[PDB]
Design a binder for this molecule. Sequence first.
Ligand SMILES: CC(=O)c1ccc(N2CCN(C(=O)CN3CC[C@@H](C(=O)Nc4ccc(O)c(Cl)c4)C3)CC2)cc1
Length: 337
Amino acid sequence: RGQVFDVGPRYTNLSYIGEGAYGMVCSAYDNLNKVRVAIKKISPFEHQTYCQRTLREIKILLRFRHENIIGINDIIRAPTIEQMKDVYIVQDLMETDLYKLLKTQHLSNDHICYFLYQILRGLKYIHSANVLHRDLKPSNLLLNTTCDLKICDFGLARVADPDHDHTGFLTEYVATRWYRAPEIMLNSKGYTKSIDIWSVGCILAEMLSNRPIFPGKHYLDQLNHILGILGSPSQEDLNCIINLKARNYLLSLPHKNKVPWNRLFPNADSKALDLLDKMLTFNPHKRIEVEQALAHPYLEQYYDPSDEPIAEAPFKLDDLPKEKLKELIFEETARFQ
Ligand SMILES: CC(=O)c1ccc(N2CCN(C(=O)CN3CC[C@@H](C(=O)Nc4ccc(O)c(Cl)c4)C3)CC2)cc1
């Protein structure tokens, strides 16, 4: 679109797909490996934050190999650090994403069940590598005509760090508001695996009704949408809240009873709602883990631990200047030259 998309000599015949904060994505013909691929142009080097998100996307996707996780097939950039101003990331081309599908189609239970299984199968692999995605939502679940589902966008991913998850009440957060677990607003930095399970619970709810379950209009409104459905937290859950300010705030609220899942989703499968309840558990310590979710009765037709692979070894940037991050991005993309 009169921007500049220099991907030769391997890729030709471009067509605009979309754009966002990250940059722009087109489809293109891989003249060396038969078919059309997706190529995204990233221009991150003027700011540390954009460099961090780019290095995470690249380092992680290059180390992962899983059917339900988008791969990186190739990376195009200049031959020297001085001339490198953009980076083009080549990935398998997908037809749509769950966000776009839910705007035009109501899904049958058997589609919801199969898509949920794939999300959880990919998430099992991510979590087995000690990685957190931290921004799961419908637009980050890519889909094709044969209903294959691939998780994308690891720009906000982190290595899990439960010992350093604690933070103060109403601490700012970057990931997508509607998919934030309640603890993000109360006492958590989103450094435990439970953060992702909550987001998957939101996605399941959204597949059941074609509407976001907790559409907060702003930061604090997100927690009151969550409490408006889950109802007031139990005494046990309040005494696990850590922060004086978070405890005081929850104790100051009028009592609110839980809205039954069968009243929000009167046409849903009862086993889907039992699993939804366990993913949307207020206390992250009581929230179901990915392996338990895969073993839940709702997914019994697909559950097969021998066909739900894990990573061969776990993964083991904050305040690193943009210049150092550019050098690391250069080194990480060297294998494709
Ligand atoms: C603000 C700013 O300058 C900025 C700069 C960088 C930045 N990063 C975010 C994380 N990165 C990504 O590339 C994430 N991508 C972007 C697009 C999405 C994706 O994978 N789509 C996709 C893939 C295959 C397909 O077949 C199809 Cl149809 C679509 C996730 C790195 C860059 C964020 C922000």
